[PDB]
Amino acid sequence: ANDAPIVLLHGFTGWGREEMFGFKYWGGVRGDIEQWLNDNGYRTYTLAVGPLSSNWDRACEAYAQLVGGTVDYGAAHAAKHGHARFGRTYPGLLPELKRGGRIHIIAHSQGGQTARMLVSLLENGSQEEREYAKAHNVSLSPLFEGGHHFVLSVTTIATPHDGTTLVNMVDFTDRFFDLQKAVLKAAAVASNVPYTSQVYDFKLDQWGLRRQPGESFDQYFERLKRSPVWTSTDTARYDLSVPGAEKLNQWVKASPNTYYLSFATERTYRGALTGNYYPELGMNAFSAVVCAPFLGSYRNATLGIDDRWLENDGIVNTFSMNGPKRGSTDRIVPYDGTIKKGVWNDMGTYNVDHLEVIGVDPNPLFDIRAFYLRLAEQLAS
Numbered sequence: 001a002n003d004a005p006i007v008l009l010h011g012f013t014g015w016g017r018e019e020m021f022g023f024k025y026w027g028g029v030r031g032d033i034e035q036w037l038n039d040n041g042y043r044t045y046t047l048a049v050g051p052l053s054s055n056w057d058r059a060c061e062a063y064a065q066l067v068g069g070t071v072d073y074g075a076a077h078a079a080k081h082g083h084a085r086f087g088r089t090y091p092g093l094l095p096e097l098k099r100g101g102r103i104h105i106i107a108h109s110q111g112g113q114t115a116r117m118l119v120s121l122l123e124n125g126s127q128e129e130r131e132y133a134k135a136h137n138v139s140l141s142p143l144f145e146g147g148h149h150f151v152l153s154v155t156t157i158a159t160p161h162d163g164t165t166l167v168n169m170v171d172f173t174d175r176f177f178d179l180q181k182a183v184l185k186a187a188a189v190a191s192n193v194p195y196t197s198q199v200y201d202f203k204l205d206q207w208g209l210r211r212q213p214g215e216s217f218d219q220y221f222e223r224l225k226r227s228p229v230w231t232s233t234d235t236a237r238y239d240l241s242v243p244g245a246e247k248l249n250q251w252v253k254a255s256p257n258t259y260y261l262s263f264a265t266e267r268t269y270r271g272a273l274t275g276n277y278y279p280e281l282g283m284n285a286f287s288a289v290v291c292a293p294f295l296g297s298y299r300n301a302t303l304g305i306d307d308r309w310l311e312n313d314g315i316v317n318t319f320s321m322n323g324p325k326r327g328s329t330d331r332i333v334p335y336d337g338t339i340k341k342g343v344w345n346d347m348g349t350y351n352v353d354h355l356e357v358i359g360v361d362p363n364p365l366f367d368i369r370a371f372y373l374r375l376a377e378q379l380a381s
Protein backbone atom coordinates (compact mmCIF):
# COMPACT_ATOMS: atom_id res chain seq x y z
CA ALA A 1 0.00 0.00 0.00
CA ASN A 2 2.70 2.55 1.01
CA ASP A 3 5.87 4.58 0.57
CA ALA A 4 6.43 5.91 4.13
CA PRO A 5 9.97 6.25 5.35
CA ILE A 6 10.87 4.83 8.71
CA VAL A 7 12.15 6.85 11.65
CA LEU A 8 14.03 5.01 14.44
CA LEU A 9 13.64 6.38 18.01
CA HIS A 10 15.54 5.22 21.00
CA GLY A 11 14.56 4.95 24.67
CA PHE A 12 16.15 6.17 27.88
CA THR A 13 19.50 5.47 26.54
CA GLY A 14 20.28 6.60 22.95
CA TRP A 15 22.44 8.90 20.87
CA GLY A 16 22.94 10.20 17.29
CA ARG A 17 24.74 8.54 14.38
CA GLU A 18 27.96 10.50 15.15
CA GLU A 19 27.85 10.16 18.88
CA MET A 20 29.68 7.28 20.68
CA PHE A 21 32.35 7.27 17.97
CA GLY A 22 29.89 5.76 15.49
CA PHE A 23 28.82 2.82 17.67
CA LYS A 24 25.14 2.66 16.76
CA TYR A 25 22.34 2.54 19.22
CA TRP A 26 20.37 0.82 16.46
CA GLY A 27 22.51 -2.25 15.84
CA GLY A 28 25.21 -1.87 18.54
CA VAL A 29 27.80 -4.76 18.22
CA ARG A 30 25.85 -6.50 15.40
CA GLY A 31 25.88 -3.64 12.85
CA ASP A 32 23.97 -0.60 11.65
CA ILE A 33 20.26 -1.26 11.39
CA GLU A 34 19.58 2.02 9.41
CA GLN A 35 22.21 1.01 6.85
CA TRP A 36 20.52 -2.47 6.45
CA LEU A 37 17.12 -0.95 5.97
CA ASN A 38 18.50 1.54 3.39
CA ASP A 39 20.50 -1.18 1.48
CA ASN A 40 17.26 -3.10 1.31
CA GLY A 41 15.39 -0.20 -0.12
CA TYR A 42 13.49 1.06 2.93
CA ARG A 43 14.30 4.70 3.47
CA THR A 44 15.19 5.15 7.13
CA TYR A 45 16.28 8.03 9.46
CA THR A 46 17.37 8.07 13.15
CA LEU A 47 16.07 10.61 15.71
CA ALA A 48 18.24 11.60 18.67
CA VAL A 49 16.41 13.21 21.69
CA GLY A 50 17.13 13.64 25.38
CA PRO A 51 17.44 10.15 26.88
CA LEU A 52 16.47 11.37 30.40
CA SER A 53 13.92 14.06 29.41
CA SER A 54 10.23 13.56 29.70
CA ASN A 55 8.21 12.10 26.80
CA TRP A 56 6.73 15.60 26.31
CA ASP A 57 10.19 17.20 25.97
CA ARG A 58 11.20 14.29 23.74
CA ALA A 59 8.14 14.54 21.51
CA CYS A 60 8.79 18.31 21.15
CA GLU A 61 12.37 17.67 20.16
CA ALA A 62 11.25 14.97 17.71
CA TYR A 63 8.83 17.31 16.11
CA ALA A 64 11.68 19.86 15.58
CA GLN A 65 14.15 17.29 14.18
CA LEU A 66 11.52 16.05 11.73
CA VAL A 67 10.07 19.21 10.21
CA GLY A 68 13.01 21.56 11.09
CA GLY A 69 13.01 24.60 13.34
CA THR A 70 13.67 25.43 16.98
CA VAL A 71 12.44 23.19 19.77
CA ASP A 72 9.35 24.68 21.42
CA TYR A 73 8.36 22.95 24.70
CA GLY A 74 5.18 25.08 25.12
CA ALA A 75 5.09 28.19 27.29
CA ALA A 76 2.55 26.73 29.78
CA HIS A 77 4.67 23.54 30.14
CA ALA A 78 8.00 25.41 30.51
CA ALA A 79 6.47 27.81 33.04
CA LYS A 80 4.97 25.00 35.11
CA HIS A 81 8.22 23.05 35.18
CA GLY A 82 10.71 25.84 35.41
CA HIS A 83 12.79 25.21 32.30
CA ALA A 84 13.56 27.03 29.03
CA ARG A 85 10.68 27.34 26.50
CA PHE A 86 12.95 27.06 23.41
CA GLY A 87 15.74 24.57 22.81
CA ARG A 88 18.00 23.77 19.93
CA THR A 89 17.51 24.35 16.26
CA TYR A 90 17.16 21.75 13.59
CA PRO A 91 17.38 21.68 9.78
CA GLY A 92 14.53 19.06 9.44
CA LEU A 93 15.12 15.53 8.16
CA LEU A 94 11.77 15.37 6.36
CA PRO A 95 10.65 18.72 4.94
CA GLU A 96 8.13 16.76 2.84
CA LEU A 97 6.18 16.42 6.06
CA LYS A 98 5.05 20.05 5.53
CA ARG A 99 3.10 18.99 2.34
CA GLY A 100 1.30 15.84 3.48
CA GLY A 101 4.17 13.34 3.75
CA ARG A 102 3.74 10.44 6.22
CA ILE A 103 6.13 8.28 8.30
CA HIS A 104 6.47 5.06 10.29
CA ILE A 105 8.20 5.09 13.67
CA ILE A 106 10.17 2.15 15.03
CA ALA A 107 10.59 2.87 18.70
CA HIS A 108 12.53 0.96 21.35
CA SER A 109 11.93 1.07 25.12
CA GLN A 110 10.69 4.45 26.35
CA GLY A 111 10.82 5.57 22.70
CA GLY A 112 7.45 3.91 22.37
CA GLN A 113 5.81 6.20 24.86
CA THR A 114 7.37 9.14 23.09
CA ALA A 115 6.13 7.97 19.70
CA ARG A 116 2.65 7.65 21.20
CA MET A 117 2.73 11.11 22.63
CA LEU A 118 4.06 12.59 19.39
CA VAL A 119 1.07 11.10 17.57
CA SER A 120 -1.44 12.30 20.06
CA LEU A 121 0.05 15.89 20.00
CA LEU A 122 0.21 15.99 16.24
CA GLU A 123 -3.45 15.01 15.96
CA ASN A 124 -5.01 16.85 18.92
CA GLY A 125 -2.53 19.40 20.13
CA SER A 126 -2.71 20.47 23.71
CA GLN A 127 -5.80 22.33 24.97
CA GLU A 128 -3.73 23.63 27.87
CA GLU A 129 -1.12 25.17 25.52
CA ARG A 130 -3.73 26.74 23.23
CA GLU A 131 -5.42 28.47 26.21
CA TYR A 132 -2.20 29.60 27.88
CA ALA A 133 -1.30 31.15 24.51
CA LYS A 134 -4.52 33.19 24.04
CA ALA A 135 -4.55 34.11 27.76
CA HIS A 136 -0.95 35.49 28.00
CA ASN A 137 -0.68 36.67 24.37
CA VAL A 138 2.34 34.57 23.35
CA SER A 139 3.15 32.42 20.26
CA LEU A 140 2.08 28.73 19.90
CA SER A 141 4.00 25.93 18.22
CA PRO A 142 2.00 24.35 15.41
CA LEU A 143 2.56 21.06 17.32
CA PHE A 144 -0.09 22.33 19.79
CA GLU A 145 -2.75 23.34 17.26
CA GLY A 146 -3.89 19.86 16.40
CA GLY A 147 -4.95 18.62 12.94
CA HIS A 148 -1.41 17.57 11.88
CA HIS A 149 -1.60 13.86 11.44
CA PHE A 150 1.47 12.55 9.73
CA VAL A 151 2.49 9.30 11.41
CA LEU A 152 1.01 6.36 9.59
CA SER A 153 2.13 3.66 11.87
CA VAL A 154 3.93 3.25 15.11
CA THR A 155 5.83 0.11 16.16
CA THR A 156 7.13 -0.36 19.74
CA ILE A 157 9.79 -2.79 20.92
CA ALA A 158 10.05 -3.70 24.57
CA THR A 159 8.24 -0.49 25.55
CA PRO A 160 7.08 0.04 29.10
CA HIS A 161 3.54 1.10 28.15
CA ASP A 162 2.46 0.46 31.69
CA GLY A 163 5.72 1.44 33.43
CA THR A 164 8.46 -0.81 34.69
CA THR A 165 9.03 -1.89 38.29
CA LEU A 166 12.79 -1.26 37.92
CA VAL A 167 12.06 2.24 39.22
CA ASN A 168 10.96 0.86 42.57
CA MET A 169 14.42 -0.62 43.32
CA VAL A 170 15.85 0.90 46.61
CA ASP A 171 19.07 1.96 44.78
CA PHE A 172 17.31 2.76 41.48
CA THR A 173 19.09 6.08 41.30
CA ASP A 174 22.66 4.66 41.42
CA ARG A 175 21.81 1.56 39.31
CA PHE A 176 20.13 3.58 36.57
CA PHE A 177 23.21 5.70 36.08
CA ASP A 178 25.21 2.48 36.30
CA LEU A 179 23.31 1.32 33.20
CA GLN A 180 24.25 4.46 31.30
CA LYS A 181 27.72 3.41 32.40
CA ALA A 182 27.24 -0.12 31.02
CA VAL A 183 25.91 1.11 27.66
CA LEU A 184 28.94 3.40 27.52
CA LYS A 185 31.30 0.42 28.22
CA ALA A 186 29.71 -1.60 25.37
CA ALA A 187 30.78 1.24 23.11
CA ALA A 188 34.44 1.11 24.35
CA VAL A 189 33.85 4.32 26.32
CA ALA A 190 35.14 4.90 29.87
CA SER A 191 33.20 6.69 32.57
CA ASN A 192 36.42 7.88 34.44
CA VAL A 193 37.86 9.76 31.45
CA PRO A 194 37.29 13.50 30.81
CA TYR A 195 36.70 13.45 27.04
CA THR A 196 36.98 16.62 24.99
CA SER A 197 34.45 15.69 22.29
CA GLN A 198 30.77 15.47 23.30
CA VAL A 199 30.61 11.61 22.87
CA TYR A 200 27.09 11.24 24.43
CA ASP A 201 25.05 14.44 24.54
CA PHE A 202 22.14 14.18 26.93
CA LYS A 203 20.48 17.17 25.25
CA LEU A 204 19.64 18.94 28.47
CA ASP A 205 19.82 22.52 27.00
CA GLN A 206 16.39 23.28 28.45
CA TRP A 207 17.59 22.51 31.99
CA GLY A 208 20.83 24.27 31.19
CA LEU A 209 22.78 21.10 31.98
CA ARG A 210 25.77 20.26 29.88
CA ARG A 211 28.93 18.24 30.61
CA GLN A 212 32.01 20.35 31.57
CA PRO A 213 35.60 20.53 30.27
CA GLY A 214 37.61 17.98 32.30
CA GLU A 215 34.42 16.28 33.62
CA SER A 216 34.11 12.51 33.25
CA PHE A 217 30.73 10.84 32.91
CA ASP A 218 31.05 9.50 36.49
CA GLN A 219 31.23 13.10 37.65
CA TYR A 220 28.57 14.39 35.22
CA PHE A 221 26.14 11.64 36.38
CA GLU A 222 26.54 12.60 40.04
CA ARG A 223 25.37 16.09 39.17
CA LEU A 224 22.58 14.79 36.93
CA LYS A 225 21.30 12.75 39.86
CA ARG A 226 20.75 15.97 41.75
CA SER A 227 19.22 17.98 38.91
CA PRO A 228 15.62 18.65 37.98
CA VAL A 229 15.95 16.09 35.17
CA TRP A 230 16.26 13.39 37.80
CA THR A 231 14.20 14.89 40.67
CA SER A 232 11.31 16.74 38.90
CA THR A 233 8.05 15.14 37.57
CA ASP A 234 9.17 16.30 34.14
CA THR A 235 11.56 13.31 33.62
CA ALA A 236 11.92 9.93 31.90
CA ARG A 237 12.26 8.76 35.47
CA TYR A 238 8.66 9.66 36.19
CA ASP A 239 6.91 8.53 32.94
CA LEU A 240 8.84 5.22 33.33
CA SER A 241 7.30 4.33 36.74
CA VAL A 242 3.96 2.54 37.02
CA PRO A 243 1.92 5.54 38.34
CA GLY A 244 3.75 7.79 35.81
CA ALA A 245 2.97 5.57 32.86
CA GLU A 246 -0.64 5.28 33.84
CA LYS A 247 -0.90 9.09 33.97
CA LEU A 248 0.48 9.40 30.45
CA ASN A 249 -2.01 6.65 29.38
CA GLN A 250 -4.93 8.73 30.62
CA TRP A 251 -4.40 11.46 27.98
CA VAL A 252 -2.23 9.71 25.33
CA LYS A 253 -4.58 7.64 23.24
CA ALA A 254 -4.37 5.59 20.07
CA SER A 255 -5.22 7.80 17.07
CA PRO A 256 -7.74 6.10 14.71
CA ASN A 257 -5.60 7.15 11.74
CA THR A 258 -2.49 5.27 12.93
CA TYR A 259 -1.65 1.63 12.99
CA TYR A 260 0.05 0.46 16.10
CA LEU A 261 2.32 -2.57 16.45
CA SER A 262 3.87 -4.01 19.65
CA PHE A 263 6.72 -6.36 20.25
CA ALA A 264 7.40 -7.88 23.70
CA THR A 265 10.64 -9.37 24.82
CA GLU A 266 11.61 -11.90 27.57
CA ARG A 267 14.77 -13.48 28.76
CA THR A 268 13.78 -15.16 31.94
CA TYR A 269 12.76 -18.55 33.37
CA ARG A 270 10.26 -19.13 36.14
CA GLY A 271 11.36 -20.84 39.40
CA ALA A 272 8.95 -23.64 40.48
CA LEU A 273 9.37 -23.18 44.26
CA THR A 274 9.37 -19.36 44.49
CA GLY A 275 7.27 -18.39 41.42
CA ASN A 276 10.06 -15.82 40.87
CA TYR A 277 11.62 -15.29 37.40
CA TYR A 278 15.40 -15.46 36.88
CA PRO A 279 17.74 -14.36 34.07
CA GLU A 280 18.38 -16.91 31.33
CA LEU A 281 21.94 -17.59 30.22
CA GLY A 282 23.45 -15.03 27.94
CA MET A 283 21.24 -12.19 29.22
CA ASN A 284 23.40 -9.02 29.29
CA ALA A 285 25.63 -9.01 32.34
CA PHE A 286 24.53 -5.82 33.87
CA SER A 287 20.79 -6.62 33.73
CA ALA A 288 21.64 -10.21 34.83
CA VAL A 289 23.38 -9.20 38.01
CA VAL A 290 21.74 -5.84 38.86
CA CYS A 291 18.10 -5.58 37.52
CA ALA A 292 16.58 -8.91 36.59
CA PRO A 293 16.75 -10.42 40.11
CA PHE A 294 14.69 -7.53 41.43
CA LEU A 295 12.29 -7.41 38.47
CA GLY A 296 11.57 -11.11 38.72
CA SER A 297 10.78 -10.99 42.40
CA TYR A 298 9.29 -7.59 43.30
CA ARG A 299 5.56 -7.75 44.15
CA ASN A 300 3.45 -4.89 45.52
CA ALA A 301 -0.25 -5.39 46.10
CA THR A 302 -0.88 -1.61 46.40
CA LEU A 303 0.48 -1.00 42.95
CA GLY A 304 -1.41 -4.12 41.71
CA ILE A 305 1.99 -5.70 40.94
CA ASP A 306 1.60 -9.50 41.10
CA ASP A 307 3.04 -12.66 39.45
CA ARG A 308 2.00 -11.42 35.91
CA TRP A 309 4.59 -8.69 36.16
CA LEU A 310 7.55 -10.83 37.09
CA GLU A 311 8.42 -12.09 33.62
CA ASN A 312 10.91 -9.61 32.15
CA ASP A 313 13.66 -8.85 29.53
CA GLY A 314 16.28 -7.60 31.99
CA ILE A 315 14.92 -3.97 32.23
CA VAL A 316 11.13 -3.91 31.57
CA ASN A 317 8.39 -6.22 32.77
CA THR A 318 7.11 -8.24 29.79
CA PHE A 319 3.51 -7.68 30.86
CA SER A 320 4.04 -3.98 30.27
CA MET A 321 5.01 -4.27 26.52
CA ASN A 322 1.97 -5.31 24.49
CA GLY A 323 0.37 -1.93 24.77
CA PRO A 324 -0.97 0.47 27.37
CA LYS A 325 -3.59 -1.07 29.71
CA ARG A 326 -3.29 0.85 33.00
CA GLY A 327 -5.33 4.01 32.73
CA SER A 328 -5.91 3.29 29.03
CA THR A 329 -8.97 2.86 26.68
CA ASP A 330 -6.75 1.53 23.80
CA ARG A 331 -7.53 -1.92 22.34
CA ILE A 332 -4.94 -4.64 21.94
CA VAL A 333 -5.55 -7.56 19.62
CA PRO A 334 -3.16 -10.32 18.71
CA TYR A 335 -1.63 -10.26 15.18
CA ASP A 336 -3.92 -12.19 12.74
CA GLY A 337 -1.77 -11.81 9.57
CA THR A 338 -3.30 -8.33 9.09
CA ILE A 339 -2.45 -4.99 10.60
CA LYS A 340 -5.56 -3.25 11.91
CA LYS A 341 -5.85 0.50 12.16
CA GLY A 342 -6.58 2.41 15.42
CA VAL A 343 -5.59 -0.36 17.86
CA TRP A 344 -2.51 -2.26 19.10
CA ASN A 345 -1.50 -5.16 16.98
CA ASP A 346 0.31 -7.45 19.44
CA MET A 347 3.06 -9.11 17.37
CA GLY A 348 3.99 -11.47 20.20
CA THR A 349 6.92 -12.02 22.45
CA TYR A 350 10.53 -12.78 21.50
CA ASN A 351 13.07 -14.54 23.56
CA VAL A 352 15.53 -11.68 23.41
CA ASP A 353 16.78 -9.31 26.10
CA HIS A 354 16.32 -5.50 26.27
CA LEU A 355 19.77 -4.65 24.81
CA GLU A 356 19.98 -7.74 22.52
CA VAL A 357 17.00 -6.61 20.50
CA ILE A 358 18.77 -3.45 19.21
CA GLY A 359 21.98 -5.43 19.13
CA VAL A 360 23.82 -3.60 21.85
CA ASP A 361 24.44 -6.92 23.55
CA PRO A 362 25.44 -9.90 21.31
CA ASN A 363 23.04 -12.85 20.78
CA PRO A 364 24.09 -15.27 18.00
CA LEU A 365 20.67 -17.02 17.83
CA PHE A 366 18.91 -13.77 17.32
CA ASP A 367 18.76 -12.87 13.68
CA ILE A 368 18.58 -9.17 14.14
CA ARG A 369 18.84 -8.29 10.47
CA ALA A 370 15.92 -10.56 9.41
CA PHE A 371 14.08 -9.25 12.42
CA TYR A 372 14.29 -5.64 11.26
CA LEU A 373 13.70 -6.39 7.55
CA ARG A 374 10.46 -8.21 8.50
CA LEU A 375 9.32 -5.24 10.51
CA ALA A 376 10.14 -2.92 7.60
CA GLU A 377 8.17 -5.18 5.21
CA GLN A 378 5.14 -5.31 7.52
CA LEU A 379 5.06 -1.50 7.76
CA ALA A 380 5.06 -1.28 3.89
CA SER A 381 2.26 -3.87 3.70
Ligand SMILES: [Ca+2]
Pocket residue numbers: 282283284356361362363
Ligand atom coordinates in the same frame (compact mmCIF):
# COMPACT_ATOMS: atom_id res chain seq x y z
CA1 LIG B 1 23.35 -11.82 25.09
Ligand SMILES: [Zn+2]
Pocket residue numbers: 054056057073077081083234
Ligand atom coordinates in the same frame (compact mmCIF):
# COMPACT_ATOMS: atom_id res chain seq x y z
ZN1 LIG C 1 9.72 19.65 30.07
